[PDB]
Design a binder for this molecule. Sequence first.
Ligand SMILES: [Zn+2]
Ligand SMILES: [Zn+2]
Lengths: 126, 131
Amino acid sequence: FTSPAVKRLLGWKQGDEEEKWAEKAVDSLVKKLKKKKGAMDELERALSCPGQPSKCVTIPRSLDGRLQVSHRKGLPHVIYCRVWRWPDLQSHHELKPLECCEFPFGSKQKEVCINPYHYRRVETPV
Amino acid sequence: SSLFSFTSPAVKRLLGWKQGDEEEKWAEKAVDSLVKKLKKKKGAMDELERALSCPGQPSKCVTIPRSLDGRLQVSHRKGLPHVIYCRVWRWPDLQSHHELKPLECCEFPFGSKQKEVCINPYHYRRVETPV
DNA sequence: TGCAGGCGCGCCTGCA
DNA sequence: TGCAGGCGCGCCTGCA
DNA sequence: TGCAGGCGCGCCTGCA
DNA sequence: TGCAGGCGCGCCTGCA
Ligand SMILES: [Zn+2]
Ligand SMILES: [Zn+2]
């Protein structure tokens, strides 16, 4: 679609503070996943082919569930579903776990699955 | 390839799967709108690429026609074109035209009330909004 | 050469 | 007086 | 009673 | 071995 001149000019475009923050959040996750054998590999498979079923990609759970990245807090399944699937995701009230997920946020286990393809988008209850 | 600007190859790979929000998608539409205008003028696209490639070197005016209210519409959104393109390539948090002043180098600054308005982001400086 | 659809500038109203 | 947004006629392209 | 944000102690790395 | 600074989870308050 896009012409080669437009792509060239877009490379000079400045990313806003939310885009800069999302890079910080991705880096935070990579430091965690690099420590687990196969984790970075499993996530990349999930992201590359959305139509094919993938395994859980989990991180440790905090007491309130929230994760802090560069002075901002959020729920990690919301954080990474915003990054790779729905940038306009409102809250956790808009997400539901698929049957394949063994560590979904809400299951109250030691680890929480952050694989964006283990959750589906729903309507927030009235 | 810097100290602070550096992203690791793993982060770079994962970031390629990142979805851009509705403002980023809009900014691509705005850039495309400008390229259809500049491709019609001899040397215009070239001067724009020059301006953005080397910010330290002086560039010439890169102008587009001016509308009656000054506003430009791109994909159902309106704004002032010098604000629009200064947000794209220089300051994403730019509030309004009140935060902008033209440099003496600019022959066609917004507010000069001329047929054409300069959209070269390096022909404007960021200032404090008057109270 | 007739349709058919998409979108922006110039118009309009509605606030404060 | 200034902004801010909404919508249509006149423009445009894309077919056959 | 759920969010939301602010900040410090305990952790960590990077020097010499 | 010592310092020096950076940042996050667990704490805290402030609303409705
Ligand atoms: Zn899962
Ligand atoms: Zn100029």
